[PDB]
Amino acid sequence: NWLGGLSRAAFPKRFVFGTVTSAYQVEGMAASGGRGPSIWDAFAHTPGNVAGNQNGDVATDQYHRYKEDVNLMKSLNFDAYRFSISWSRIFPDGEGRVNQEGVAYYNNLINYLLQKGITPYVNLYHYDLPLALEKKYGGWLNAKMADLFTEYADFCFKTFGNRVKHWFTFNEPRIVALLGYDQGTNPPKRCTKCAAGGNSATEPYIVAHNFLLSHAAAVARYRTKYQAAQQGKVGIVLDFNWYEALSNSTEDQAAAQRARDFHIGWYLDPLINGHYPQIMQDLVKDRLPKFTPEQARLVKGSADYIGINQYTASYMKGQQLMQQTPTSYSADWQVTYVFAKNGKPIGPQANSNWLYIVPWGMYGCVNYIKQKYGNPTVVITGNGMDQPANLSRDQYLRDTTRVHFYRSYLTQLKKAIDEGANVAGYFAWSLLDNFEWLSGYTSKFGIVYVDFNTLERHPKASAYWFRDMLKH
Numbered sequence: 001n002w003l004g005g006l007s008r009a010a011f012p013k014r015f016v017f018g019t020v021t022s023a024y025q026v027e028g029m030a031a032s033g034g035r036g037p038s039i040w041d042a043f044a045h046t047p048g049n050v051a052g053n054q055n056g057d058v059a060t061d062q063y064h065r066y067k068e069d070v071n072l073m074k075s076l077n078f079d080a081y082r083f084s085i086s087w088s089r090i091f092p093d094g095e096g097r098v099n100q101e102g103v104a105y106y107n108n109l110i111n112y113l114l115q116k117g118i119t120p121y122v123n124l125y126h127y128d129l130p131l132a133l134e135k136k137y138g139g140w141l142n143a144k145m146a147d148l149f150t151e152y153a154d155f156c157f158k159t160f161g162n163r164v165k166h167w168f169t170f171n172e173p174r175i176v177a178l179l180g181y182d183q184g185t186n187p188p189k190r191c192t193k194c195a196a197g198g199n200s201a202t203e204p205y206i207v208a209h210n211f212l213l214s215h216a217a218a219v220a221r222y223r224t225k226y227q228a229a230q231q232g233k234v235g236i237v238l239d240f241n242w243y244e245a246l247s248n249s250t251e252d253q254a255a256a257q258r259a260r261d262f263h264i265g266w267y268l269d270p271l272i273n274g275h276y277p278q279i280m281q282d283l284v285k286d287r288l289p290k291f292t293p294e295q296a297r298l299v300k301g302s303a304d305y306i307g308i309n310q311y312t313a314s315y316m317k318g319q320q321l322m323q324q325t326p327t328s329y330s331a332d333w334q335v336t337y338v339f340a341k342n343g344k345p346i347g348p349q350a351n352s353n354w355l356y357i358v359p360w361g362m363y364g365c366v367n368y369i370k371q372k373y374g375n376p377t378v379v380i381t382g383n384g385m386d387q388p389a390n391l392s393r394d395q396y397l398r399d400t401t402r403v404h405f406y407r408s409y410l411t412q413l414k415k416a417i418d419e420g421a422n423v424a425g426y427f428a429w430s431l432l433d434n435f436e437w438l439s440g441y442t443s444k445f446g447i448v449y450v451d452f453n454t455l456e457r458h459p460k461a462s463a464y465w466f467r468d469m470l471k472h
């Protein structure tokens, strides 16, 4: 049967199912309703930066149509909705003056979700730093971001926290550090060679450190000022794609483990254990900032749950560890990516070149976190796959590959959970086709089709699959 034995009965009692979006990717009204620009508005408006010179000015226009989209997620039997608040829609300059119209939007969205029986899971940050803070402070290179982010978080806790009980601070700080400061392909476009300046060997580590310190400061503020009255929780969202040793050799197994540590351990070891992974300390040395004992104690235990975005898996091949002139965070790992074993690809690719369809990667990742980090509460905060541009409407709706994707990946998640992993929830990226960063509207991740000419929504087969699987 097309559900492949899956239903709410196949998951733990009270397991949470939802869908996910982010502000810049779906809201639209980017320069309206009092919203100030983010670094992504500046980046997307520069010719050549995004596919087709597209931008999030209108996106899916969820700003005007949010009740339609909430009605739709309820009709599909979801329990929860993960979305983000745009910092520059609340504080156009990132600090100081509050945009009351922006505040009213999120109030209206939250209230409607609750009216419809959908639990809000709210991200404070999803790549969309206020442009004013980039220009004035240098963004995530500046330790002052801890204070700036904390004041923003404080306002959100105060304003929405009587209703919102499930918060996340950041979304994938690894990707910010990697793409923004190592490779220089996302804003602020920094890297050793880049026109904007930068240093691919040092800046990604500075940035990650400041994300961890800011997360910790925001959570300390929540716990000391708001938690007694509000009784909610705050976590963080981290990306984790799986790494599998190419062979059982000592060096291939070491390589796969090094990749895990540089990928997820970079954040989880501080959040769980209060230090950076030993291998990163050993290889990155004085380029890796040191937490003071007080800072490490603030960071350790500061996530009430760990959000994991899980998409794909790679084979890793090793080498003898070498003394090397530092060049980049990426080269620091001393690993070799490989996409076939025994003459077979690890999986077929979705539309995005990086996205290999490997359902057992989901089991790999969840099992690994369970075994290595004392089985913390995990929420799968995003998982999904994309269709290419230029299909007909009907071709978009017949998304049989995405149906197979979710059935297979959710079967592997169920496998990890049945073996004892503490997973509390699962969220599909995305509710809607949306603005896919550098790919613009050329990549379609939604279980709901969005016609970007007319803005109409049409559920795809994968939406109906969820509705059938999730019926109460």
Ligand SMILES: OC[C@H]1O[C@H](F)[C@H](O)[C@@H](O)[C@@H]1O
Binding pocket: 022, 025, 171, 172, 309, 382, 383, 429, 436, 437, 445
């Ligand atoms: O690449 C698909 C999707 O991956 C992650 F979930 C990011 O948080 C999203 O912003 C992105 O659109």
Ligand SMILES: [Zn+2]
Binding pocket: 061, 064
């Ligand atoms: Zn509109």
